[PDB]
Paper text:
[name], a member of the [name] 4 superfamily, is implicated in a variety of diseases including Joubert, hydrolethalus and acrocallosal syndromes. It is also involved in primary cilium formation and the Hedgehog signalling pathway and may play a role in cancer. Members of the [name] superfamily of motor proteins (Kifs) move unidirectionally along microtubules (MTs) in an ATP-dependent manner. [name], a critical regulator of mammalian Hh signalling, acts as both a positive and negative regulator in the Hh signalling pathway but performs this role differently from Cos2 in that it does not interact with Smo or Fu.
In our effort to characterize human kinesins of medical interest, we report here the crystal structure of the human [name] motor domain to 1.6 Å resolution. Of the seven [name] and Kif27 constructs used for crystallization, only Kif78–347, which lacks the neck linker region, yielded crystals. Kif78–347 crystallized as a monomer with one molecule per asymmetric unit. Data were collected to 1.6 Å resolution and the structure thus belongs to a small group of kinesins solved to a higher resolution. The final structure included residues 12–347 (missing regions: 107–114, 207–211, 230–241, 260–273) with bound Mg2+ADP (octahedrally co­ordinated) in the catalytic site and 328 water molecules. [name] contains an eight-stranded β-sheet core with three major solvent-exposed α-helices on each side, displaying the characteristic arrowhead-like structure typical of all members of the [name] superfamily solved to date. Alignment of Kif78–347 with conventional [name] (Kif5b) revealed their high structural similarity. In Kif5b the switch I region (residues 199–205) consists of a small helix (α3a), whereas in [name] it forms a loop (L9). The switch II cluster (helix α4/loop L12/helix α5) is in the so-called ‘down’ or ‘obstructive’ position and one would expect the neck linker (Arg350–Asn356) to be either unstructured or structured but in an undocked position with respect to the motor domain. Kif78–361 contained the neck-linker region but did not crystallize, whereas Kif78–347 lacking the neck linker revealed that the C-terminal residue Gln347 shows crystal contacts indicating that there would not be space for a neck linker in this crystal form.
Numbering used by the authors: 9 to 103, 112 to 202, 209 to 226, 239 to 256, 271 to 344
Write the structure that this text describes.
C-alpha cells in the first residue's frame, strides 16, 4: 500500500529564439536508457526520461495515466511540474498539443461512464499560492485570510473557504480552467504555484480521493526559506531510507501542507522535471537535474 515518488525528466526542444541567439544543446538524452548526460561528464538517470520528440500523449501515458488508475481505486495522486521558467512546465501540465490536465480529465469521465455500479461525483478547485497566500481562481473573489488549510483526525487535508465546482464533463472542466486562468492576471505567474485539485467521491460507504495537478513556480535561483526548497526537503526525505520512516517535514510551506495526504507515503506521486537543453541554461539545468535526483 506504499509507493515511492516517481521522477520523470522531460527535455524540450531548443526553441527558435535560442537557436537564433546562437545557443546549442548541452544535453545528450537517452530515453530508452532512462538517462541524460549534461556537458561532457555529468550523467543522470531517472525513472522516466522523455526527449524532445516525445509528444503530449506520450508524456501522459508514461507519467500520468497510471496515477488515474490509483485515483479511481481511492488513492490520492499528485503530478507536479518543476523547473526553471521557460523549461515547459505549463506546456506540459496543460491547465494534439493539449497537456496533462485535459487528457486526464477526458479519461476520468470515460472511466466514470464505464463503472456503472458506482455512483460518482466529481468536483474541482483551482488555487494559486503566492508568498504563502492563497487565491481562489474560481471565485468572484475571496480574501486570502479567509482561505485556511487544516488537517482532520485521519490525516486528510481539509480546505476551508475554497470554492468546489461540480463537473460532469471535459467541456465544463475546460471552461473553468479558462475562467480561472483569466482571473489569475487581474505579480508574474512564473513566481507563483497553481494547484488544480480534482476530488472523486464514489459510492456503491463513501470513497473519496484527490488528484492534484501542480504547475510550480520557476526554480531559478539568484535553510528552507522558499516553498520549492520545502518541497525538495519533503521529497528528499521520502526518498532517503534513513529519513523516510520518520516524520516527513510537510509543515514548512502551504504547498507541502496542501499536498500532505497526496505526496509519497500511501499516495501516488510523479514529479515531471522540465529542462531546457540550451547551453545558455546550463547552470539552471544542472540545478534541476540535481534537485530531481534528490527525490530518487
Ligand atoms: N516539449 C515542448 N515542445 C515544444 N515546445 C515547448 C515544449 N515545452 C515548452 N515549449 C515551449 O517553450 C516555451 C516555454 O514553455 P512554458 O510551458 O511557458 O514554460 P514554463 O511554464 O516552465 O515557464 C513556450 O513557448 C512553449 O510553447
Ligand atoms: Mg508556466
Amino acid at each position: 500500500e506504499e509507493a515511492p515518488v516517481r521522477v520523470a525528466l522531460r527535455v524540450r526542444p531548443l526553441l527558435p529564439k535560442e537557436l537564433l541567439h546562437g545557443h546549442q544543446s548541452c544535453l545528450q538524452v537517452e530515453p530508452g536508457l532512462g538517462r541524460v548526460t549534461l556537458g561532457r561528464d555529468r550523467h543522470f538517470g531517472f525513472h522516466v526520461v522523455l526527449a524532445e520528440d516525445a509528444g503530449q500523449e506520450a508524456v501522459y501515458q508514461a507519467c500520468v495515466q497510471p496515477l488515474l488508475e490509483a485515483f479511481f481505486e481511492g488513492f490520492n495522486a499528485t503530478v507536479f511540474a518543476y523547473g526553471q521558467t521557460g523549461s515547459g512546465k505549463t506546456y506540459t501540465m496543460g491547465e494534439d498539443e493539449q497537456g496533462i490536465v485535459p487528457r486526464a480529465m477526458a479519461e476520468a469521465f470515460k472511466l466514470i461512464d464505464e463503472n456503472d455500479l458506482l455512483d460518482c461525483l466529481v468536483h474541482v478547485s483551482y488555487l494559486e499560492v503566492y508568498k504563502e497566500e492563497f487565491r481562489d481562481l474560481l471565485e468572484v473573489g475571496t480574501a486570502s485570510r479567509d482561505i485556511q488549510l487544516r488537517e482532520d483526525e485521519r490525516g486528510n487535508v481539509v480546505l476551508c473557504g475554497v470554492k468546489e465546482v461540480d463537473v460532469e464533463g471535459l467541456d465544463e472542466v475546460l471552461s473553468l480552467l479558462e475562467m480561472g486562468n483569466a482571473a489569475r492576471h487581474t505579480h508574474l505567474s512564473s513566481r507563483s504555484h497553481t494547484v488544480f485539485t480534482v476530488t472523486l467521491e464514489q459510492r456503491g460507504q463513501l470513497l473519496v480521493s484527490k488528484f492534484h495537478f501542480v504547475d510550480l513556480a520557476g526554480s531559478e535561483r539568484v535553510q528552507i526559506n522558499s516553498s520549492l526548497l520545502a518541497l525538495g526537503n519533503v521529497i528528499s526525505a521520502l526518498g532517503d531510507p534513513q529519513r523516510r520512516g520518520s516524520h516527513i517535514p510537510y509543515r514548512d510551506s502551504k504547498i507541502t501542507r496542501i499536498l500532505k495526504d497526496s505526496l509519497g507515503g500511501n499516495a501516488k506521486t510523479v514529479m515531471i522535471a522540465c529542462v531546457s537543453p540550451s547551453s545558455s541554461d546550463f547552470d539552471e539545468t544542472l540545478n534541476t537535474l540535481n534537485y530531481a535526483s534528490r527525490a530518487q
